[PDB]
């Protein structure tokens, strides 16, 4: 199956990009809720395209694509530092999810990108430290720790890496969609399917969370849950 070739490629940094475009604030949508736990639109989308799409340093066009500087003189772990385009040879072949979020020493991205697979540099393997389906958040290096948390009340921007192009910082204010439970409040955006792992970053580089699990709705708009850093619940002693 998979979990045998999942390569990283830095494209940008996890930060507000000056390409700030107001496109969110999308009012009331109707999304088809699957048994309350899941939520989606009943329209089969298909849009596996981000990494490559031009001779942009990172690439190969054979296996995967990279931008990883782990050096033989003093290195051990992997750290390209920032917002990554990411692509595996697995599941349905050679396809890119896009956004891999590594800040300081912690790599923290979405769960729905996988079912808890291992990472690498096209034939050099590195294991993640955490995977959680509930919040839809995975970690590498250790337990995730930032600070900020976005929720439907304040306005933010989503840092979505474009296919073959620059990190599209889209200004996304709170949105919501109608539900069997009444309404869910989330990030409602009229735009192309934003990259999986897109960090929720303010103009001042605040919050720096993650776009949650969602779908291309109206076969045109992209609406997804809000994911944020609650700080990793280390109830257990880290050593003793």
């Amino acid at each position: 199956g998979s979990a045998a070739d999942l390569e990283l490629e830095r494209a940008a940094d996890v930060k507000w990009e000056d390409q700030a475009e107001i496109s969110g604030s999308s009012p009331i949508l109707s999304i088809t809720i699957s048994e309350d736990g899941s939520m989606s639109i009943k329209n089969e989308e298909e849009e596996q395209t981000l990494g490559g799409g031009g001779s942009g340093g990172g690439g190969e066009f054979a296996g995967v694509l990279w931008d990883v500087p782990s050096p033989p003189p003093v290195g051990k772990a992997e750290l390209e530092d920032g917002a990554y385009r990411i692509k595996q040879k697995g599941i349905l072949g050679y396809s890119q999810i896009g956004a891999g979020v590594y800040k300081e020493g912690t790599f923290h991205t979405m769960w729905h990108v996988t079912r808890g697979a291992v990472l690498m540099h096209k034939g050099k393997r590195i294991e993640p430290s955490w995977a959680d389906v509930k919040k839809d958040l995975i970690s590498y290096g250790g337990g995730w720790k930032l600070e900020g948390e976005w929720k439907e009340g304040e306005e933010v921007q989503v840092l979505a890496l474009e296919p073959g192009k620059n990190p599209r910082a889209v200004q996304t204010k709170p949105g919501l969609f109608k539900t069997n439970a009444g309404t869910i409040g989330a990030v409602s955006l009229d735009f192309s399917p934003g990259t999986s792992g897109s960090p929720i970053i303010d103009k001042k580089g605040k919050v720096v969370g993650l776009y949650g699990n969602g779908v291309v709705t109206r076969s045109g708009a992209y609406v997804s849950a809000i994911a944020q850093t609650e700080k990793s619940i280390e109830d257990n002693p880290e050593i003793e």
């Binding site: 998979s2 999942l6 390569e7 990283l8 849009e47 596996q48 981000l50 990411i86 692509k87 595996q88 697995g90 599941i91 349905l92 396809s95 890119q96 999810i97 896009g98 891999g100 990108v113 996988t114 990472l119 399917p193 934003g194 990259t195 999986s196």
Partner: peptide, 4 residues
């Protein structure tokens, strides 16, 4: 790393 696959779809989105």
């Amino acid at each position: 790393l696959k779809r989105x």
